[PDB]
């Protein structure tokens, strides 16, 4: 009924009404980082 990763965490499932296999991938997330020249030099920024 369920799948597992090596670190013993769920990563796939049986859909219980149509028995095809669904991979569960975690929702996209991460750090937000602001690239900037010195605020004395310019007021512009770029975002990673």
């Amino acid at each position: 009924q369920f799948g597992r990763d090596i670190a013993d965490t769920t990563d796939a499932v049986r859909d219980p009404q149509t028995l095809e296999i669904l991979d569960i991938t975690p929702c996209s997330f991460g750090g937000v980082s602001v690239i900037t020249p010195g605020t004395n030099t310019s007021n512009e920024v770029a975002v990673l």
């Binding site: 990763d5 670190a7 965490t9 975690p26």
Partner: peptide, 22 residues
């Protein structure tokens, strides 16, 4: 460097081969 490839040398390839939630 072995340029036929990443410009790794032959011995660097052996080293790169031999090594090896959210």
């Amino acid at each position: 460097p072995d340029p036929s490839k990443s410009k790794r040398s032959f011995i660097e390839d052996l080293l790169f081969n031999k090594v090896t939630k959210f």
